[PDB]
Design an enzyme around this catalytic site. Structure first.
Site, short mmCIF file in Angstrom:
data_model
loop_
_atom_site.label_atom_id
_atom_site.label_comp_id
_atom_site.label_asym_id
_atom_site.label_seq_id
_atom_site.Cartn_x
_atom_site.Cartn_y
_atom_site.Cartn_z
N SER A 97 0.82 -1.21 0.00
CA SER A 97 0.00 0.00 0.00
C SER A 97 0.86 1.26 0.00
CB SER A 97 -0.95 0.01 1.21
OG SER A 97 -1.98 0.99 1.07
N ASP A 239 -1.58 1.41 -3.83
CA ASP A 239 -2.49 0.40 -4.38
C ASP A 239 -3.87 0.97 -4.65
OD1 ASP A 239 -2.96 0.60 -1.55
OD2 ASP A 239 -3.55 -1.49 -1.41
MG LIG Z 1 -3.93 1.30 0.23
#
Ligand SMILES: [Mg+2]
EC number: 5.4.2.2
Length: 448
Positions: A97, A239
């Protein structure tokens, strides 16, 4: 002790100390035993180690007789969408992320993109992995490459009436994550003029980690908005399951206010729907939902809790103040793309700028933003706050931490479960002065 890479809701760790190709393969073996029958969708983000970890995961799955559908470089929400759309048994996204470069991890879902959490299988996977000494088997199943994003793209576009869109000028900042690939695939189908900042996927992250909350990343987006006279700006994490908004003045918009705005945008299309929200900041969301003719549903924060509550209520939308937005039509999952399409449509149809839409709500319900306190003893700090305010007899609620409603102001106080860390959110009814005094008052009580 146990494997540190396994957290409550996903797997996250430093590479290769806490997460490596061997653990990834063993996770693949163990996952195959937890899912119902069917293939498994795999995707990965731009991080350098992500393809290797996904291939190890694929080997372990196929060694256990699972067909694998490899959707390649993608955002996390594409794993959610494809898992549901292909009726797969489950899905794994390889991603860290927004974390530093030496980090990676995985988000796991089962059928219909339902989350796998520590009490819904994740720690069963952990214990299996931790006890697996066996030699790697050989793949007895196929990996199909399916990189076509057409169904996902068509799904995104279905949320807006494209004949009502104006040719807004939008700054987009992928932070060298994966978001710019989707923007470029959507762009032929939209009237917007895009200004692309940090656009190319690059796991070396030459412009810093894709975390739009870092002030240097914030300033890059804000500067691009102001320099180009953009109508607003959007930034994503790596992401892109989180999106962050900047109005045309370059102001970073606190995520609380987006929940009410998205609720009213959605409720105009699904009148009378239910909207799930978390308890940290509530008053603006409740008012905007009710004014739009919907029903607000209070729920514990955390994506696992929100998604389960949306399913049990048939809620059309759920939002968190921390830039998580969930949509019933999107398999009850979160997307960092749907939110800004809806906001662009709202700006287009209303003739109001994003600034004016947000300003009105900020004046009615000023909030502190979320404030973190490391303390020596959480229980003692909480007791010190509670006893201090006891004589005002607040209305208390314990859905998620402690919420205390005093009439003209309220706060929510949550304690971390791992570490002694308290998180504070305060808001008032139209009183910025009261907001500041109470916030500093509580802050002092929490500290020395
Ligand atoms: Mg994320």
């Amino acid at each position: 002790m146990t494997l540190p890479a396994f957290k409550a809701y996903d797997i996250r760790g430093r590479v290769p100390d806490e997460l490596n190709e061997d653990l990834a393969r063993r996770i693949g073996v163990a996952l195959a035993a937890q899912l119902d029958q069917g293939p498994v969708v795999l995707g990965h983000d731009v991080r350098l180690a992500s393809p290797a970890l996904q291939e190890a995961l694929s080997a372990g799955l196929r060694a256990s007789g699972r067909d694998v559908i490899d959707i390649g470089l993608c955002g996390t929400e594409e794993v959610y969408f494809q898992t549901d759309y292909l009726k797969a048994a489950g899905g794994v996204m390889v991603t860290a992320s927004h974390n530093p470069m030496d980090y990676n991890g995985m988000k796991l879902v089962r059928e219909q993109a339902r989350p796998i959490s520590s009490d819904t299988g994740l720690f069963a996977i952990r214990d299996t992995v931790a006890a697996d000494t066996a030699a790697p088997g050989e793949p007895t199943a196929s990996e199909q490459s399916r990189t076509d994003k057409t169904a996902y793209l068509e799904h995104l576009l279905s949320y807006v009436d494209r004949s009502t869109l104006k040719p807004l000028k939008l700054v987009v900042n992928a932070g060298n994550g994966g978001a710019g690939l989707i923007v470029d695939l959507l762009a032929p189908h939209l009237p917007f003029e895009f200004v692309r900042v940090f656009h190319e996927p690059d796991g070396n992250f030459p412009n810093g980690i894709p975390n739009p909350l870092l002030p240097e990343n914030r300033d890059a987006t804000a500067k691009a908005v102001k320099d180009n006279g953009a109508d607003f700006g959007i930034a994503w994490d790596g992401d892109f399951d989180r999106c962050f908004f900047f109005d045309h003045t370059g102001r970073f918009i606190e995520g609380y206010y987006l929940v009410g705005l998205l609720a009213q945008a959605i409720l105009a299309k699904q009148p009378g729907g239910k909207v799930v929200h978390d308890p940290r900041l509530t008053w603006n969301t409740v008012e905007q939902v009710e004014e739009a003719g919907g029903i607000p549903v209070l729920c514990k924060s955390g994506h696992a809790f929100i998604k389960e509550k949306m399913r049990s209520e048939n809620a059309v939308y759920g939002g968190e103040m921390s830039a998580h937005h969930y949509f019933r039509e999107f398999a009850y999952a979160d997307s960092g793309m749907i939110p800004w399409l809806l906001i662009a449509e709202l700006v287009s149809q209303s003739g109001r700028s994003l600034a004016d839409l947000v300003e009105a709500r900020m004046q009615k319900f000023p909030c502190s933003g979320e404030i973190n306190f490391k303390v020596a003893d959480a229980k003692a700090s909480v007791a010190r706050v509670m006893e201090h305010y006891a004589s005002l007899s607040p209305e208390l609620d314990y859905t998620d931490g402690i919420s205390a409603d005093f009439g003209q102001w309220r706060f929510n106080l949550r304690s971390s479960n791992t570490e002694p860390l308290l998180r504070l959110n305060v808001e008032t009814r139209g009183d910025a002065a009261l907001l500041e005094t109470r916030t500093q008052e509580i802050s002092n009580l929490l500290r020395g």
